[PDB]
Structures are given as structure tokens and as C-alpha cells.
Design a protein around this ligand. Structure first.
Ligand SMILES: Nc1nc2c(ncn2[C@@H]2O[C@H](COP(=O)(O)OP(=O)(O)OP(=O)(O)O)[C@@H](O)[C@H]2O)c(=O)[nH]1
Ligand SMILES: Nc1nc2c(ncn2[C@@H]2O[C@H](COP(=O)(O)OP(=O)(O)O)[C@@H](O)[C@H]2O)c(=O)[nH]1
Ligand SMILES: [Mg+2]
Lengths: 291, 304
């Protein structure tokens, strides 16, 4: 297939529409307040990396809407599903029900799209106090894992998220990096890029969302998302100039350029003054291979 | 007590944000109080403690049952600027009313007073909303004061939020409008961008969002939002990999060609400019700025 269908389900207020809005619609964190409850299933698509396209299914979670996806349209909904990003609101009271509904969804999937990938997000982790944020995740993932296991899907992946930090990008990067087929060639091409630039490391980002695609190297493990987040924050301050990001050089050491209408590269250079010119040239041959 | 240079007054109904605002501002004004007081201390008018001092006043729902007593008036005179906080969360017609009052009354006692009004808590609001919101408010006072007989009072309106960058961009202008003694720096900037392919220039202290100064250029394009964030990019991106041009600098160029340029000036004080080249390439457009800048840099180095 060339198209991907993702299910963004969870109960109302889980904050899953804010997500989509920040990740594929250029919304700011606080910009999500005005969203308002989504009615039924709100559809969004996004051609991602040329050959691959995306079909995002944001399922308004008001109990009533929810009951209908599992009954009437369960075949419509759980039909041909690539991925399920189920979201739980860390501030929920109805946690046990929150989880039941999740099983309900797994039931409909274990049946209509059994090989779909399961992804869970403990959203709004910014409301929990730091000392607690970890064990609660551990505890929640523990339970969720067992439930997930009984409906077919054994090992699932978990991600603690908040629209107020970069933890949201890491999750969505890995999620989308699951639907990309051709990654062998990208790293391979990236690794070579690295050496011809003799850089400390090079990263690949999707021009539009600024999510990480791959890389090639102490250093911050969350550095990848923190880059996504910061550049996306720059993206949004550059609204008024109404022009897209082309390039940026930081201290003659870090170069960030667009390669094609799909990929952007980030190179931390290992030097301080390689003839800026001869470094850029190496950038222009790179476009050939990342279109 | 506070031996400050200016005396801003923050008035508004309870919970408008007048105390939260003081906290955010007093903090970001430190780099400046520092800078203009000793980093470079010249106007004999400067050996003071701090540049400004925000004295707040609580405003009762409606000013009918009451009007300002004398002690308030004696304050109005001491006050150089008057900042009115309109909580945008709720309705604001009777507030636009009490503003005409606070003006007329203040103005008789101390004209030449800066009257600044903040359309606050505008975080999480549609744009055409902020448009109407203001455009509507701006009119409702140009009528409320023509009724009060004083249409000549200059009123500057702002759109702010303390979870935003707005309150810093507003107060930046606000502080400048207040203290003229710190305009020699604005002037040095009107020179840097004078005769230039440079549109705007800000002087930001790495640890404050209230710019220290920028050009007199009228067409402020609210390029503040853009340059202000550029600093954070530079700092943040740099901070991750860290293990006449010997310092910190960052250059970025958009689709249409505009350039965001940042160059450190003096130990934590950076210059952020907007450079627009009609075709002229970057590499050399960049070098010609460096000239006017390196000059400007010396200028600050001379007075420091
Ligand atoms: N504290 C915190 N709040 C969030 C976060 N994400 C979203 N919110 C807030 O929660 C609200 C929930 O709204 P949505 O995201 O639109 O609701 P939803 O999860 O998409 O569900 P819908 O009503 O069912 O269809 C918004 O008002 C946001 O301000 C978060 O990460 N942390
Ligand atoms: N959303 C939002 N809340 C704000 C803003 N400014 C202040 N607040 C909140 O408004 C409430 C009252 O603020 P406070 O400073 O105590 O008001 P005061 O009584 O006038 O000093 C607090 O919960 C603040 O955090 C703003 O710009 N946006
Ligand atoms: Mg929603």
C-alpha cells in the first residue's frame, strides 16, 4: 500500500485533537484551547515524504460517539487500520473505564485489522508533579501492556506526552517512523553524507512537521525532539514574515538547510571554519539523494 | 522604598493580572536596570537604583459609588506612565468607561502622562477575534473621550498575555516611551539601519525579553516576535552540542529571502536584525551589515 490510516482515539478531553493540530496544522500549545470538542470522526491527511501519504482519524471521544464506533460503524472505523494511537488523559478520574474503552477498541481491531500497530500515549504529563511522573507511567504502562496482550497485540509501545514540551515530538516521530518503509537507504545515504561532511552527526527531518526521520553519529538523548520543538517554535514566530524556513547557520558550526520539498537536514560540523563555501557545496549535492 | 527613575502605575479590577504582570516585568527589567545604570552609566540622570518601579492600584467593579481621593492624585503626578489592564476574559464595556474616567481625572492633574492600555489575557483567542476585540475597543474610547471632551489624549493600545511574549514587546515600547534618557541607544540604531538593506534592529539582553532598544523606524513590523525568538533558537540549539568576529552569531534566511541575523555585542548582549535583499545574494549582503554593525559595536565598546 501507499496510504496509511491511523486511529487517534481516546475519551473526550484526552487532548488528542490538540496533538494533531500541533503536529500537522501549525498550532501553538495554548492555541489548542479554542479547538472545542470534535464531533464524531474528524479526518486529516498529509502526504509524508513523497511516496507515503497519511490519513489521520481523530475520533471525538464523547461517550456517545465512542459507543457508536464500536457498534454501528465498527466495520467502517476498524477497517483497514495501519496504526492505533490511543490516548489516555493522565488527569482522568475514570481511569478504569478509560482502560475498558481501550479494550473495546482492541476487540474491534483484533478482528478487523489484527496486524495494526498499537501505540499508547499518557497525555498531559505536564499536570503531574515531577517526582510522580515516572512511577505513574511505569504503573500505567504495566496495566496497559497486559490488556493489550490479551487482545492479540503483545508488546506495544508507550510514550508520556505533553503539548507543553518536546515529549510530544518524540512519540509522533517514532510513530510515523514506523510507516516509513525505505529507511535502510536513507541512513545509508545519511551515513555517507556524514563522512563527506566529516560532521559530528547529521539528522533528517520532514520539512513540514519537522519530525525526525533518522540520524548518524554524552549528548542529550532527547536532543532530537528538542530540535523538532525549537525549530517548530521558530517556524511559528516566522509567521508574520509569511515565508518558510530555508536555512540557518549557527556559529559557523551548525548548519540547517532544506534539501527538498520533503526533507530538511541538520549538521553539527566538528570544526569552526571549514570554508563555509565548500561546506555549502557539499550540501547542494545532498539534495540529489534526499528528494 | 525605591529610588527608581520612572514610576509606572498598574490599575485594574481585581484578578486582571496586575500582580502577575509586575512579577514578569520587574524580573526582565533587571538586565536593563543593570545595563543603563552601570554597564554604561552616563546621563548624570542615571545614577539611580533601578529604571522603573511598577506601583499597582486595585479598581472596584464600578467607579460610580466612588471616585479617587487626593492621595491617589498626588500619586498620579509622581507616576510617569499609566497602564490600564482590561481583562479580556469577560465583557469590557463598563471597563472602557472607567478608563475614560481615570484618564480625564488623571490628565487634569498630570497631563504629559503616558496612558497605556493593555488588552490582557489574550492567550488562546482567534485572530479575527483580537482584531475585532481591539478595533472595537479602540473606537469605544475615541467616543467615550469625545464625550468627556478630550479627544486629544494620546492613547496607545496593546494586545498582551503573560504566558506570551506580548507583554514584553508592549512594555519594551512602554519603557522607551517613559525614559528618554535611554534613547541615545535607539539613535545609534537608527544609524546602523540608516542607509541600509537592513529593516529592523533590536538590542536584546540574552536573559530578558524586554528588548533594551531598537530603531525609531515607525513601521515597527512587530518583527519583535521573530527576533525575540531567534535568540532562544541560537541559545537553545547552541546549548545542546557545546562541549573582528570572535563571538556568538546566528544567521537564518527564509523562502522569500529575508534574513534574521544575530551577533553578540558585549558579554550577553546581542543584536538581532532583519535584512532584506532584493536579489543581492546573502554572503556579501551579510558582509555589508557587518560593517555598519562592527562600527556600532565599537560605539558600545567605547562607552562601556
Ligand atoms: N495540561 C495539558 N493540557 C492539554 C494538553 N493537551 C491538550 N490540553 C488541553 O485539553 C483540552 C482538551 O481538548 P482536545 O484536545 O480538543 O480534546 P480531545 O482529546 O481531542 O477530545 P475531543 O473532545 O473528544 O474530540 C484543550 O482545551 C487543551 O488546552 C496537555 O498536554 N497538557
Ligand atoms: N490566561 C491568562 N491568565 C492570566 C494572565 N495574567 C494573569 N493571569 C491569571 O489571572 C489570575 C489573577 O492574576 P493576579 O496577578 O493575581 O491578579 P491581580 O489581583 O490583579 O494582581 C491568576 O490566576 C493569573 O495567573 C494572562 O495573560 N493570561
Ligand atoms: Mg477533539
Amino acid at each position: 500500500n501507499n496510504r496509511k490510516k491511523l486511529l487517534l482515539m481516546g475519551r473526550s478531553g484526552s487532548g488528542k485533537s490538540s496533538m494533531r493540530s500541533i503536529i500537522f496544522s501549525n498550532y501553538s500549545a495554548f492555541d489548542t484551547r479554542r479547538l472545542g470538542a470534535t464531533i464524531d470522526v474528524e479526518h486529516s491527511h498529509l502526504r509524508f515524504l513523497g511516496n507515503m501519504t497519511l490519513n489521520l482519524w481523530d475520533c471525538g471521544g464523547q461517550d456517545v460517539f465512542m459507543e457508536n464506533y464500536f457498534t454501528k460503524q465498527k466495520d467502517h472505523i476498524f477497517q483497514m487500520v495501519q496504526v492505533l494511537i490511543h490516548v489516555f488523559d493522565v488527569e482522568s478520574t475514570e481511569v478504569l473505564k478509560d482502560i475498558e474503552i481501550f479494550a473495546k477498541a482492541l476487540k474491534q481491531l483484533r478482528k478487523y485489522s489484527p496486524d495494526a500497530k498499537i501505540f499508547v500515549l499518557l497525555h498531559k504529563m505536564d499536570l503531574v508533579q515531577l517526582d510522580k511522573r515516572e512511577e505513574l507511567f511505569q504503573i500505567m504502562m504495566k496495566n496497559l501492556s497486559e490488556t493489550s496482550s490479551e487482545f492479540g497485540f503483545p508488546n506495544l509501545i508507550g510514550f508520556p506526552t505533553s503539548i507543553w514540551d518536546e515529549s510530544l515530538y518524540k512519540a509522533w516521530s517514532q510513530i510515523v517512523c514506523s510507516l516509513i518503509p525505505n529507511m535502510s537507504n536513507h541512513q545509508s545515504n545519511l551515513k555517507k553524507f556524514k563522512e563527506i561532511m566529516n560532521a559530528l552527526e547529521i539528522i533528517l527531518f520532514e520539512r513540514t512537521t519537522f519530525l525526525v526521520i533518522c540520524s548518524s553519529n554524552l549528548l542529550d538523548p532527547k536532543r532530537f525532539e528538542k530540535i523538532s520543538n525549537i525549530m517548530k517554535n521558530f517556524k511559528q514566530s516566522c509567521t508574520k514574515l509569511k515565508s518558510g524556513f530555508k536555512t540557518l547557520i549557527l556559529n559557523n558550526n551548525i548548519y540547517v538547510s532544506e534539501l527538498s520539498s520533503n526533507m530538511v537536514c541538520f549538521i553539527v560540523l566538528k570544526d569552526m571554519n571549514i570554508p563555509q563555501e565548500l561546506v555549502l557545496e557539499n550540501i547542494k549535492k545532498a539534495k540529489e539523494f534526499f528528494q | 522604598a525605591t529610588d527608581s527613575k520612572a514610576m509606572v502605575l498598574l490599575m485594574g479590577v481585581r484578578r486582571c493580572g496586575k500582580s502577575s504582570i509586575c512579577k514578569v516585568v520587574f524580573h526582565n527589567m533587571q538586565p536593563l536596570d543593570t545595563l543603563y545604570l552601570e554597564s554604561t552609566s552616563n546621563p548624570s540622570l542615571e545614577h539611580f537604583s533601578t529604571l522603573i518601579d511598577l506601583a499597582v492600584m486595585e479598581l472596584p467593579g464600578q467607579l460610580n459609588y466612588f471616585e479617587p481621593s487626593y492621595d491617589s492624585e498626588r500619586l498620579f503626578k509622581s507616576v510617569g506612565a499609566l497602564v490600564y489592564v482590561i481583562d479580556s476574559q469577560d465583557e469590557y464595556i463598563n471597563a472602557i468607561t472607567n478608563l475614560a474616567m481615570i484618564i480625564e481625572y488623571a490628565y487634569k492633574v498630570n497631563p504629559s502622562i503616558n496612558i497605556e492600555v493593555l488588552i490582557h489575557k489574550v492567550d488562546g483567542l482567534s485572530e479575527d477575534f483580537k482584531v475585532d476585540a481591539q478595533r472595537d475597543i479602540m473606537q469605544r474610547t475615541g467616543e467615550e473621550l469625545l464625550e468627556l471632551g478630550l479627544d486629544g489624549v494620546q492613547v496607545s493600545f496593546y494586545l498582551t498575555s503573560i504566558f506570551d511574549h506580548s507583554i514584553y514587546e508592549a512594555f519594551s515600547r512602554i519603557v522607551q516611551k517613559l525614559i528618554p534618557e535611554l534613547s541615545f541607544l535607539e539613535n545609534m540604531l537608527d544609524n546602523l539601519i540608516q542607509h541600509s538593506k537592513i529593516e529592523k534592529a533590536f538590542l536584546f539582553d540574552v536573559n530578558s525579553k524586554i528588548y533594551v532598544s531598537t530603531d525609531s523606524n515607525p513601521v515597527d513590523i512587530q518583527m519583535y516576535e521573530v527576533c525575540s525568538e531567534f535568540i532562544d533558537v541560537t541559545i537553545d540549539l547552541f546549548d545542546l552540542y557545546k562541549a573582528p568576529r570572535n563571538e556568538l552569531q546566528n544567521v537564518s534566511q527564509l523562502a522569500n529571502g529575508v534574513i534574521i541575523y544575530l551577533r553578540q555585542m558585549i558579554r550577553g548582549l546581542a543584536l538581532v536584525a532583519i535584512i532584506r535583499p532584493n536579489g543581492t545574494d546573502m554572503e556579501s549582503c551579510l558582509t555589508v551589515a557587518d560593517y555598519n554593525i562592527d562600527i556600532f559595536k565599537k560605539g558600545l565598546e567605547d562607552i562601556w
